[PDB]
Symmetry: C2
Subunit: 340 residues, 2 copies
Amino acid sequence: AYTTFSQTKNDQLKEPMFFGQPVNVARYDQQKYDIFEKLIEKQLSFFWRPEEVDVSRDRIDYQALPEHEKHIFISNLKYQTLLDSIQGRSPNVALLPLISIPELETWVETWAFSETIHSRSYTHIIRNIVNDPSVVFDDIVTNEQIQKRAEGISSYYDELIEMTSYWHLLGEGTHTVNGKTVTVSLRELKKKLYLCLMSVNALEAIRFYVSFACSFAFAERELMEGNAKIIRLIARDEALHLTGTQHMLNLLRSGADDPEMAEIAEECKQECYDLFVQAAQQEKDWADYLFRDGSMIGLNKDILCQYVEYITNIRMQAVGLDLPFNTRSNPIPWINTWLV
Amino acid sequence: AYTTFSQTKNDQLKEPMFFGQPVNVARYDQQKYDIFEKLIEKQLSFFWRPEEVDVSRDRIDYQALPEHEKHIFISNLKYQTLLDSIQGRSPNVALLPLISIPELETWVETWAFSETIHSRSYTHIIRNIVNDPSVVFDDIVTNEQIQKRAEGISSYYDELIEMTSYWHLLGEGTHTVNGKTVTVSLRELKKKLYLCLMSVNALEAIRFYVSFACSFAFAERELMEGNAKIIRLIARDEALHLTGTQHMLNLLRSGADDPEMAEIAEECKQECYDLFVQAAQQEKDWADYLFRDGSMIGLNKDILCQYVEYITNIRMQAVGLDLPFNTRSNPIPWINTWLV
Ligand SMILES: [Fe+3]
Ligand SMILES: [Fe+3]
Ligand SMILES: [Fe+3]
Ligand SMILES: [Fe+3]
Ligand SMILES: [Hg+2]
Ligand SMILES: [Hg+2]
Ligand SMILES: [Hg+2]
Ligand SMILES: [Hg+2]
Ligand SMILES: [Hg+2]
Ligand SMILES: [Hg+2]
Ligand SMILES: [Hg+2]
Ligand SMILES: [Hg+2]
Ligand SMILES: [Hg+2]
Ligand SMILES: [Hg+2]
Ligand SMILES: [Hg+2]
Ligand SMILES: [Hg+2]
Ligand SMILES: [Hg+2]
Ligand SMILES: [Hg+2]
């Protein structure tokens, strides 16, 4: 029941962010939430081209890196590549079919587009530091530790997409599909979308930042400067992306949008909390693999764990959740000079 | 059965453009088809911001225009706005769930993104020429003469999307849903995709170009010059978009990407031909409504009717279809000053 151009003349200012009438005319002279228009304008002002960044010396730096440092650097890069591969397509496939206001529709498409630029930058880096990129790219898919760290991301998007298709095809109700009873509940679909957004928020807010810390650890010793310039630019984009998710989530919580979403945000509060705790544990577990061949000065399992707890508390506080970790000061204040 | 990250390590150089394993890793160091990477590169190199175009004098030009000319200009602009509203979201929602090679996936997202910029440019123009943009935007959804084509375009996308959901959810076969038999055929889905792509090719290559003639006719008179600059940038992007659909269609019908698709194309060849003529006829009938109160310097019902046949022959020939109209040289070579 999805349509690329709804024929009903509706007041886009009164539609809910999600699950309302699909957007027909794309207009930007007015908006229900100006924050999304501001985010679009910001992201567009940040447009950058990866191939323009000089990465000619990163090859020399990487090649001369001790083996364990190569492992750390490349493992981190592979995870970043995984995230943006997923983030380039997922917002469009999973969220686009559910948006009912133009500013949010275009923000999602712009956001997704910016992630494809990130992916293009990783190819730019990879192709210029290793002889055979295929070894790196192929490993992203088969690496058990990389997929264990990311487990839950694609699966959540996939479930939401499947539930969305059932909704658009059959509508609300209890149906009989090939002899099996299938329930299509919009409230349940709203819950899935809501928790998906919270998961994406955690991906943006924590997963990416942990990886930035590892990238900039090399920038601190004046190595991989081409990669550093790129990660700085990517970080600037991710900051906008997480601002977008924090606002979507907090606006839904406010009850100023779909009233049902406000009820859902409250009822599912523990699930929100749980997914953050789970994501944090995954990031921590990754350290055992990251430093399997040795650590670096200022970058090891303990420092990584402290940073995960540090940033997780900040991000959870930002969306109204209790803090699961002991409070602490930034374990790696040097990261500030690289962010924003 | 769609996934945002297929867990199987596959050779992306050997997958078909569509219906293969969903793209997992986004890489750009290699490609099955170079054209899509080159198109991505070109499109990124053409990035532009509408707000940077001075449209301060279009206001007075528009007010000074005779009433029938205001109708011509605004009706045309409304149609362009409709086309890009649909094109900003549809390639993403309709094609992403079916693409199996990374270069094509990112091209589609880049292409769709470029369309959102176009939509933003129309808002820039409209808000600077009428005082109350709402009157213009609302008429787009309700305008009888416009919605004719709108529904026809949306239909192809909407049906493809619906059939794609059934395919991902139930797979091929004869299923039952609430007492009704629902048959899912990959062959029929492929035909749907082919028809849809041909329709988009006609939209990109014919519908847009007819509107460009309508727009640049004013530019020739040094009127609505801000609009002219924007449409010129839009036409530059559209040339890339049509290049992309022409390659997709030609690769699908030759049989080098998927034998079944080549077989289907030949099968529904007559349908495709009438599909194109129909689209041309619609643009013709439109030119009518456009001049139902008079003509202007350089454009009228007949000259526009001639341009439609001229461009249609060229575009249809490009994708292996017979020529429906008598051959002639360009009716308005002056338009070349503004096109690629
Ligand atoms: Fe990213
Ligand atoms: Fe992001
Ligand atoms: Fe366009
Ligand atoms: Fe286009
Ligand atoms: Hg999500
Ligand atoms: Hg998600
Ligand atoms: Hg890391
Ligand atoms: Hg780290
Ligand atoms: Hg829940
Ligand atoms: Hg919550
Ligand atoms: Hg810790
Ligand atoms: Hg299509
Ligand atoms: Hg289509
Ligand atoms: Hg026209
Ligand atoms: Hg025209
Ligand atoms: Hg056909
Ligand atoms: Hg056709
Ligand atoms: Hg004619």
